[PDB]
Design a protein around this ligand. Structure first.
Ligand SMILES: Nc1ncnc2c1ncn2[C@@H]1O[C@H](COP(=O)(O)OP(=O)(O)OP(=O)(O)O)[C@@H](O)[C@H]1O
Ligand SMILES: Nc1ncnc2c1ncn2[C@@H]1O[C@H](COP(=O)(O)OP(=O)(O)OP(=O)(O)O)[C@@H](O)[C@H]1O
Ligand SMILES: [Mg+2]
Ligand SMILES: [Mg+2]
Lengths: 563, 585
């Protein structure tokens, strides 16, 4: 329940409309109750007056009251919906960008603690549920309570005993019934929040891996596990319906209780006079109509159990501390970058052994260095240390004889160009898949680099405008490899880290690309991890890594001589 | 398109025949709530007249109080039943709609699943199907109650006053009219609402999967603006959908609030003598005024609810547009093949003017003419982007083809998909690991495999050498997108899958990707042995080693331009020799 405090502070940035949507809710309920309360008394007072009391009884003022309350009822409810929803969905905006803003600072290792399909649930689905806090958990509660006080105070002039009797039934219902259903529905709301995110994870994982699951016959046996989550999810939805059904039944029974009591009690006397006259219908119709103030409160605390469960999930994500932090010291990007590593060691999270054991190399500016080794020997773990993916443990990495931890993030990204081993093709257009690096490039610059890497047939038909990735054209294994090279070429950073750039390319294209990298990367520091011994005679040094440590180091000509 | 909406509504209404017994009970229970409301109003009005006009003390009125209490208890019980009866109607239909969609996603394959982002499939299955609940739970039973209950109320008022009954029907006909003109665009507004949500959800999970690339290039500030734009399009669609509901509900409350005013004014005036026409030539009673005033809100309740649930129907029509399109579009094959080859012996592959097309329709591989006798092994060789992986995706049943591609003389379209995939195992390009642990991934073909047969796959695919590095050994989780493993370590786990279950056809799409010169040799000696047990087609680029494979297919621009054995092709010049020339320098 205390998990909602960080999100009640977002009420402040829209305190004018959010509070206006509550004042207009009280006004609507007071006019809605007044319409029935005034109409009920008007008929009875008119009936007692009869034909004889035509002139003595004032029949114009009450006639205007029922007409005025009928317009306040319909105009008030229309605007309080517009005002409350318009402000609620702009608070939802900040809640979604604020939640999304936390994902990239903790990208490589913080996001590995979660499953992607369940993270998609938090940002897109759980944020929407947590936004239900004002519309149907807060506005009903405080709007109803004020109406209880106004009705009880207003009726108190007529008769104290009857007023606190109706108020007592109504105010006691408001304070002890919602908590009772919160305790009853708290467990269901946690299971209903947990299983919606569990189904979305098991579905997106099932859909994304459908190539392998289909060939090996695991599609059916993974869908069965997916269907079991839906069965549990549908039972939680069913148990929620049982509580909603029972909650409405009790309010209708409590709704009967006051009407019966007002009928019974007011008959004895209203205001201390044994002959109440029309005053009996004033209390009965007030009790019959005032319950619509307690209508939204019925399921308000059944929303609460699910809102708090969501609030826990987002508060979990937004309270994570990224293990890599960057200073705010602005600095100018260098034009030549030379980096030194001295006994840098790194242990991956929740592990015992060391991925990197005392790597130590000094790469001068303008040097091209090739890193070789077995699979799993730490080659791509090294290239992420240079990118500040994690912080090294009792090691030191220096860029241009200055610590890599002292660089601003905006300046660190401009000094390093990376070709990852696992290229990603975003859903965006061909233009937008290349504007990740060098956003300011023109379409001629984009189209120029596409022909340089050999993707001239991506400019066919729609070309730059054509959609790529999921929902569009998918690229082959070799085309994805040359799209990452086109990104790094556009970035034009002083230091370039290539992670097997010519992987999955045939002999002809690989030579065509390696020749392209020779002239484009000239006078640039290059750390190119490869598994192919072809064309290493152009590299100033060759690094051979084994089990997270450098074994051999020197020129290709030197390495062959020493065997 | 209003023609499309009727097609969606016909589709939505067909899916409600599973829970027909549930909808009929709710209609009956809603009608019973109509009778109980009239009975409650009659007793409350009769009681009030006795106490006020005729001044009977309450100690005489016990029968009307007892019957009023019984009516209230019956009212609450029917409300309790109708809420639960309505839910079961919606749940069983939603469970059946989702099963049909998940059935077609099984048959779609990776090629048709890649036609929509995975975060947009999720909102299609979760949000769009769950948002048809109120169409089935609440709207379908309400169409009958919107006509039965209001007429039941007015028939109970004609004996009292013929004018108070005409006041309700005076304002009644405007309510159905205004409900439709306001809601003429409510179904398209919802369709664009679920389109912006699907666009927002797919955009998010795309940036989440590729968040490593975003971090490399420093797209932290740029991707916050893309989410802000996607989330603001979605917000404006939601507010557009909601504004119709508030307007429609405000209009219906305007007539409801107006009618109560006239009933109060007309009766209040009639008791005072300013009006005489309403009553049946007899003095107006107080019970008649109270009866028509308690029943005035309940005459429109069944009509306000219909307006409330009408926009729930528009929410289902908007949610069914993307669903019906997915059901409409044909999959990789026009009709689900039922034929199945019997023998587990190696299959024969025969192509005749074969053309392979993408889901959209673009041709990926040109005219392919080749023959692969049973038990023989072939190698696909060529430039990048020349259609080598497309052919292997056609042989897996993932892509639609135009010519002829016969397996043991049987057209691959006609083969049963589930039966055909049991004779086929292969390593894909950029392979993925869907399971949780590393053992669960290697044992994907058959989870209940003997530890000895599990060990053979781990040893053959060189997976057993890096097992000590892992904390839990072979039971360690591989993570999301195999993050715990390296690219070369995950590649060998993919190779372990293909070698565990023997099958009739083995395909290989760069099985030794991202493996050094030594670990590749360990893997290739396993695959060279495993390629002799059945028909094999391997897409590789190591032109040097393959001196023993039965035939080589050099593919260029989607066509097999050179087929032959490695001995003659290496010396006959042409595309293969030149392609090998750039190799080995
Ligand atoms: N879904 C798709 N829609 C449109 N075009 C596609 C699609 N998938 C692949 N292609 C195109 O088909 C061509 C060849 O595809 P394919 O991947 O079969 O060739 P490949 O030889 O396997 O390439 P590589 O050797 O790089 O893996 C590519 O140029 C690619 O652009
Ligand atoms: N997220 C992670 N958590 C824990 N351990 C990891 C993680 N990612 C990789 N490792 C371990 O680090 C070791 C080496 O990692 P790395 O990816 O640098 O090897 P690699 O040389 O890149 O492999 P390849 O050459 O095949 O790409 C592997 O044995 C792997 O098990
Ligand atoms: Mg690597
Ligand atoms: Mg391919």
């Amino acid at each position: 329940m205390r998990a909602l405090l960080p999100y009640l502070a977002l009420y402040k940035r829209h305190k004018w409309m959010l509070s206006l949507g509550i004042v207009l809710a009280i006004v609507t309920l007071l006019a809605s109750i007044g319409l029935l309360t005034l109409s009920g008394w008007f008929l009875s007072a008119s009936a007692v007056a009869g034909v004889a009391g035509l002139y003595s009884f004032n029949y114009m003022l009450p006639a205007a009251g029922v007409r005025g309350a009928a317009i306040t009822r319909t105009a008030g409810r229309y605007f309080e919906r517009l005002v409350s929803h318009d402000a609620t969905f702009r608070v939802l905006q900040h809640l979604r960008i604020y939640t999304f803003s936390k994902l990239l600072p903790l990208s490589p290792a913080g996001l590995a603690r979660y499953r992607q399909g369940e993270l998609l649930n938090r940002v897109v689905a759980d944020v929407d549920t947590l936004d239900h806090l004002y519309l149907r958990v807060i506005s009903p509660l405080v709007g109803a309570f004020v109406v209880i006080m106004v009705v009880t105070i207003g009726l108190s002039f007529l008769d104290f005993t009857l007023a606190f009797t109706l108020g007592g039934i109504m105010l006691l219902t408001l304070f002890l019934m919602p908590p009772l259903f919160y305790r009853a529905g708290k467990s269901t709301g946690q299971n209903l929040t947990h299983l919606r995110g569990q189904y979305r994870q098991q579905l997106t994982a099932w859909l994304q891996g459908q190539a392998e699951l289909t060939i090996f016959g695991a599609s059916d046996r993974y869908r069965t596990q997916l269907e079991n989550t839906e069965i549990q999810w549908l039972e939680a939805q069913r148990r929620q319906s049982e509580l909603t059904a029972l909650s409405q039944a009790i309010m209708l029974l409590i709704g009967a209780l006051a009407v019966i009591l007002m009928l019974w009690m007011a008959s004895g006397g209203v205001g201390g006079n044994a002959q109440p006259g029309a005053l009996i219908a004033l209390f009965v119709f007030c009790a019959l109509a005032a319950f619509e103030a307690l209508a939204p409160v019925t399921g308000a605390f059944q929303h609460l159990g699910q809102v708090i469960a969501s609030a826990v999930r987002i508060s979990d994500l937004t309270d994570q501390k990224p293990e890599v932090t960057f200073p705010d010291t602005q600095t100018r990007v260098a034009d030549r970058v030379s980096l030194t590593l001295r006994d840098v060691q790194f242990t991956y999270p929740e592990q015992s052994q060391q991925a990197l054991k005392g790597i130590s190399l000094q790469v001068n500016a303008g040097e091209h260095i090739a890193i070789l080794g077995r699979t799993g020997c730490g080659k791509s773990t090294l290239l992420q240390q240079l990118t500040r993916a994690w912080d090294p443990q009792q090691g030191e990495i220096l860029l241009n004889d200055s610590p890599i931890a002292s660089l601003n993030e905006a300046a660190l990204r401009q000094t390093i160009s990376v070709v990852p081993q696992r290229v990603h093709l975003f859903s965006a257009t061909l233009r937008d898949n290349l504007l990740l690096a060098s956003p300011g490039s023109s379409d001629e610059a984009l189209s120029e680099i596409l022909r340089r890497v050999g993707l001239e047939k991506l400019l066919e038909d729609a070309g730059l405008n054509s959609w790529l990735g999921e929902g569009g054209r998918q690229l082959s294994g070799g085309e994805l490899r040359r799209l990452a090279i086109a990104r790094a070429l556009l970035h034009d950073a002083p230091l370039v880290l290539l992670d097997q750039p010519t992987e999955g390319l045939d002999a002809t294209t690989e030579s065509q690309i390696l020749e392209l990298l020779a002239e484009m990367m000239r006078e640039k520091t290059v750390l190119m991890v490869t598994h192919r011994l072809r064309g290493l005679s152009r590299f100033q040094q060759i690094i051979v890594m084994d089990n997270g440590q450098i074994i051999e180091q020197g020129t290709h000509a030197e390495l062959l001589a020493r065997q | 398109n209003k023609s499309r909406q009727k097609e969606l509504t016909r589709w939505l209404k067909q899916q409600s025949v599973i829970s027909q017994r549930w909808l009929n009970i709710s209609r009956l229970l809603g009608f019973v709530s109509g009778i109980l409301i009239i009975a409650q109003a009659w007793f409350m009005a009769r009681i009030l007249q006795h106490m006020i006009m005729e001044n009977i003390p309450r100690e005489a009125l016990l029968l009307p109080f007892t019957l009023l209490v019984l009516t209230f208890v019956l009212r609450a019980w029917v409300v309790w039943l109708r809420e639960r009866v309505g839910y079961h109607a919606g749940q069983h239909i939603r469970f059946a709609i989702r099963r049909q969609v998940l059935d077609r996603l099984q048959q779609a394959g990776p090629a048709w699943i890649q036609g929509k982002p995975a975060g947009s499939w999720a909102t299609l299955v979760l949000e769009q199907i769950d948002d048809m609940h109120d169409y089935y739970a609440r709207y379908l039973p309400q169409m009958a109650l919107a006509v039965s209950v209001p007429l039941l109320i007015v028939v109970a008022i004609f004996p009292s006053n013929w004018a108070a009954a005409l006041i309700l029907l005076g304002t009644a006909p405007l309510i159905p009219l205004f409900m439709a003109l306001v809601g003429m665009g409510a179904a398209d507004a919802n369709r664009r609402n679920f389109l912006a949500l699907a666009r927002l959800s797919g955009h998010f999970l795309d940036r989440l999967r590729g968040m490593e690339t975003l971090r490399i290039f420093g797209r932290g500030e740029a991707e916050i603006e893309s989410i802000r734009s996607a989330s603001e399009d979605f917000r404006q669609r939601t507010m557009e959908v909601l504004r119709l509901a508030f307007l429609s509900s405000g209009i219906l409350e305007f007539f409801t609030s107006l009618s109560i005013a006239l009933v109060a004014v007309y009766f209040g005036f009639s008791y005072l003598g300013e009006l005489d026409f309403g009553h049946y030539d007899t003095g107006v009673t107080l019970a008649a005024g109270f009866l028509a005033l308690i029943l005035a809100p309940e005459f429109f309740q069944p009509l306000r609810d219909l307006g409330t649930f009408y926009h729930a129907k528009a929410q289902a029509v908007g949610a069914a547009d993307s669903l019906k399109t997915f059901m409409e579009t044909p999959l990789a094959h026009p009709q689900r093949g039922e034929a199945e080859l019997a023998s587990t012996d190696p299959v024969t592959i025969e192509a005749e003017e074969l053309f392979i097309t993408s889901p959209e329709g673009k041709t990926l591989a040109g005219p392919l003419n080749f023959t692969l006798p049973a038990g023989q092994r072939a190698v696909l060789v060529g430039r990048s982007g020349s259609g080598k992986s497309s052919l292997l995706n056609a042989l897996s049943g993932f892509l639609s083809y135009q010519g002829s591609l016969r397996i043991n003389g049987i057209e691959l379209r006609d083969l049963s998909p589930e039966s055909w995939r049991k004779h086929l195992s292969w390593v894909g390009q950029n392979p993925q690991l869907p399971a949780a642990t590393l053992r669960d991934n290697v044992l994907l073909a058959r989870p209940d495999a003997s530890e000895q047969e599990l060990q053979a796959a781990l040893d053959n695919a060189w997976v057993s050498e890096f097992l000590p590095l892992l904390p839990q050994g072979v039971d360690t989780p591989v993570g999301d997108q195999a993050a715990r493993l390296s690219v070369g370590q995950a590649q060998r786990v993919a190779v372990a899958r293909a070698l565990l279950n023997p099958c009739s056809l083995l395909l290989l799409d760069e099985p030794a990707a991202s493996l050094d010169a030594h670990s590749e040799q360990r893997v290739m000696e396993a695959l060279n042995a495993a390629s002799l047990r059945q028909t094999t087609l391997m897409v590789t680029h190591q032109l040097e080693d393959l001196a023993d494979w039965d035939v080589i297919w050099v593919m260029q621009d989607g066509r097999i331009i050179e087929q032959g054995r490695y001995a003659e092709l290496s010396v006959a010049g042409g595309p293969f020799a030149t392609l090998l020339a750039h190799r080995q320098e």
